Symmetry: D3
Subunit: 264 residues, 6 copies
């Protein structure tokens, strides 16, 4: 029957998986957007958040850390630099129609890669019963920040595991029952397979990004707007527009032992 692989491949995607990419969000009624440090949802996927906040979809944050380290000022202690930074995200979010932010409070550059941490995200997933999760892609070539790498990993890991009753069993017997999230979307990806048109809202994104004043001196912004405009244009060039934000959405089966998963 199945002449070759590629004949069975396209049938496994349309018939079996109901896999689609012109509109993967669409039916989204609530999505948590996971970021390693505060400002990552902004820089990563700010426009697409506003878009999903103009469409009346509920956007919740989980911020892995407290950005305790993002300063060169030999006189501004991380403890407050972090106070400074929970304000700057409470600002940023307010702009983007992000209302809620869970704060995991793990110190910056010290985000563990453990089960403890997975018990945080799995806990939050069974409670906010989110339709999709927005996490950063960990297989981003040359990514050198452990927090980024680990975040996307736990993100996808906690996701697949939240369905699992015997995982963090203490959750089951206090009200929280397993939940099957609908889609996983990987911002900060070098292999996007769905770009959102953000050409328009590309001016509210920098005001959400810059809102983090602590992280953005005007002096350093002299290399970051030239930077951000370069990135967003690369996502746009894939679907012929001025600005773009890129995501990787794969079917749930391709996140595990799928040798051909690099074809979509």
């Amino acid at each position: 029957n199945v002449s070759t692989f590629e004949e069975a491949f396209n049938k496994l995607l349309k018939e079996v998986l109901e896999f689609n990419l012109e509109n993967p969000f669409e039916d989204a009624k609530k999505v948590i957007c996971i970021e390693p440090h505060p400002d990552d949802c902004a820089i990563g996927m700010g426009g697409t958040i506003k878009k999903l906040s103009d469409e009346g979809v509920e956007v919740i944050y989980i911020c892995m850390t407290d950005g305790y380290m993002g300063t060169t000022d030999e006189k501004l202690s991380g403890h407050e630099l972090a106070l400074i930074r929970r304000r700057e995200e409470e600002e940023s979010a307010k702009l983007l129609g992000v209302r809620k932010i869970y704060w995991l409070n793990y110190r910056d550059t010290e985000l563990p890669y453990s089960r403890e941490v997975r018990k945080d995200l799995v806990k939050i997933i069974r409670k906010e019963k989110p339709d999709g999760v927005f996490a950063p892609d960990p297989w981003l070539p040359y990514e050198s920040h452990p927090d980024h790498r680990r975040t996307g990993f736990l993100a996808i890991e906690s996701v697949a595991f939240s369905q699992l009753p015997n995982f963090s069993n203490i959750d089951i017997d206090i009200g929280l029952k397993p939940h099957s999230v609908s889609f996983i979307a990987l911002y900060y990806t070098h292999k996007p397979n769905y770009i959102v048109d953000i050409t328009d809202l590309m001016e509210l994104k920098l005001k959400a990004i810059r809102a983090h004043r602590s992280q953005f001196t005007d002096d350093i912004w002299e290399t970051w707007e030239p930077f951000l405009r370069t990135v967003t244009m690369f996502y746009g060039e894939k679907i012929g527009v001025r600005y773009g934000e890129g995501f990787r959405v794969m079917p749930g089966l391709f996140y595990h032992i799928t040798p051909f998963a690099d074809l979509i």
Copy 2:
């Protein structure tokens, strides 16, 4: 060139003939069967002693809240024993680390290296940890600890108390990586496809007709992806490089 052919002397033609004993290492109950169940039968038919190592106890492989993890392990242990016999596998070592909680550490290496230094095997099988998009830590960590333990089992100063109780440094011939996206040698499983599925179905906890109805297309499609690459409809794939390509080699992928 002069090295592939005339310094190390490796071949992508047939590597398994010289093997009389091999270890097939799997992260969970069934990965041997899903990853390589046909090549498994093959070797056992051809009269080769196939031994499993299971890293973990499955404990987490369910959505049925009535079912405790503890049982699932039991139930899956026997389900594996069914599956193993179905393929000619003789002994399964059970590491027993809890599912989704496989450590990446020396203790765990130290285990693998005990066994390797007892079965003194010619070939080991494992999941390719550089498999792109592998999202399951248990799997990544199995690949890595496998390739690691192997190499290390040769080094008398590693788990140095193993020696003092008999078990000597061994030196496996090959390492074979199933569940890989860079196979450089395939095997024909068109001969034994349906039996494989049967063995893969022996894990009833895992493959309800409902789930199996969704993984039925998957497991056939995969084995095609590999199969096509030779000239058959159904094949299991493998990355084999063994030697000095697993350590510092900027042209490793050219094979």
Copy 3:
């Protein structure tokens, strides 16, 4: 206007960043090696041509090579001496006279904040103009020590700038340094090669000072291999024996979907 014009302006005008001789400002750099000899077998030829031109080349050794033998009667400490001496038998013959030994047992190198806090000390100590390390992204690399060494180098360098990372090194006199560049060797993705056919002769020998590692019997498998690597590089820019490394602007190491375009 387009993606390529914004790309080129980003590098040339916004971030400058060399590519034709990035060791032009160079005076003091560190070569971080997992085991003793990991500078040798990948960076050695490059190390003399820098000790020569004025650069005080500094070493950090991540491990102590404790595990590097087959000899079932050679204690792991015995080996660790053999290697250290053997290493000095190579430090010098390339023009390096300071080797920090971290001292962590071969095959037991932690990937922790702890180790980072060390590197950082040895980076806030010198204030080097550049650091070397193996590329942790070298495909199929199966030895944990290597992978970890790389990753920590990069993360440590970056982190040395932040006053809060190791907030005790500050308070005690050691202040943040902001390293100039980073270079990854042992890479299958170079972008700046370096000429070594002349000093290739010196290298052959410095990679033997570690003769516990490099015996006679084995060498008959490890020199054809060694020549091949030095071919793989060199012949892609001209000569018969060159060495190519990877170097990026500090900002391609974070959130850069277009990093591997170089």
Copy 4:
């Protein structure tokens, strides 16, 4: 004014600390056992003296009891399950309904925050008025699970009351909870005893319910030990068989050079 004086005028007067009846105004208590059986063996009798009197009793069980058999033929997985039944059994025979299974394997109970964060969760939900736990300062206690269980209770009772501790609990509608009294079983430093003479053959029956720990051949050694223990305790308050409990000021668990003085 003396110290002897400035001691009494604190317990009765600054703490209202009564040792006559601490299990008095107690409408819900928690029983943390390191293994299925522990509660029964140190706690057993005393559970009944609370259970039936409208005091709701809940076990937390730290391990799966996976390493309690010297039987080649019994896998730890099967044993774990077996013990669920024996504990489900035993716990009716004492009027306990709810038991949380933490499922940290036998001999591998972590000493960490991650374990605290559980006990802390369960404690905030159930909002009990009392927590029972093994005295972790019991001389010669060899079993880590045992030691750790106590420390981990004491610590989770002090910290259930902290908003900034496990903040995600608050964010999901489980607010702080202060426990009135900590009572340590398996102590040798009691200061309140419990006469359980009529309930003894019941406790032994509730302990014996574990057919995997107390086989008839093991029962010839543990029955005399079980009895001796119970004799050790009660013989202090004039009664034959008793059970012992240490109870202190919440203040006395921290920084007190004289907390030994009760």
Copy 5:
């Protein structure tokens, strides 16, 4: 001929030890504390009476105070900042200028080589004669950070003495430092008390500085405690108010079956 005889001729001739006068050489000390306000509470007095004699007193605070509140409004990062402040207006009262902050979050001080590397650092630097730390064998002490600080401190002191321990301190010109003495506050077995009869008012003031901990409602419990503890130590030497320390020869800390006899 006997034991009691061996006890003394060791103490007095060989180990030249005296309970008499231990602090009579003090030009530099370090007072280590679990939390911010810890050198206060149990040691505030002696410190001032040590500033007086021109002795430089340094603080090392192990935590950031992250978790000292019951009010879901006050957030740890801030609460920390509020506590970094309070111990400066408390340290000044007592001529304490230098305070090292390790920043380990409240209820999370690790027990590791790493945190030893830190205290051994600071100490190889400030090259002091005197280290103070809580008595990690203080009965019923139930705060992790408390226990872990004495052990770590002791271990740390004994551990500066060695070049191989943290040899990167060495390689950047920070040498072995032997310490003269060790004083364990918060002890139930002190053996050399000090006099704070007049100083018990600047005491409640230096402790008072920590108002985010000591609001005036909850002060009405610790008000009898802060005195009572100074009287426990008092009725031991004659004066009205005390601060006790255990001081033992560097030899008794290890393998000494009769440490309990001094």
Copy 6:
């Protein structure tokens, strides 16, 4: 049963447990002495090990570490010292009848307290199947060395865990069968309940101790010798001898939930 607790105490000890303390080392053919650092078995135990050769008991060491930190010598490295000390102990052990020494090779001062270690001891116990296991008391007031504390606990934990076929199963799976030790005995204790006379063996014990040259310069032997004699004196008085060695032996049942183990 019987009436008073004291009566149940005896009855449990004499008849029920059948544990006594006249000469527990008697029926011992094989014993293992566990020491934190190389030289500890010498110091604490020395004499009683010479004695146990002088009868015909095979005596095995497990040395938890490698002494990698035992020097004030600004010049001398750990690596070589660890090499130096594998001799000093081989020398000092041949002067006592000591034939086998297991080197775990944990770095001095860095010995883990973890399953990984237990498994390491459990691998040896099971193999040599000894009747006797020796180790430091870990409840020793003021003992400030993590290795000495940890090594005691891990010993007790390891003796008991050897019996459990579910603990470290692969051992079983390769020959190594469960083993049950007749007794555990704690040196470096301060509640000993049995001494061994070593007065006429003392001098030799010192030769054994001082055979660790690196640890005892002439300058250091000036203080350690009175101390050492002082120690061995302390145990003396108890059995009315010049020099003693203390041990704590307790029934296996006392190491667990016994609120009166303080009483033997």
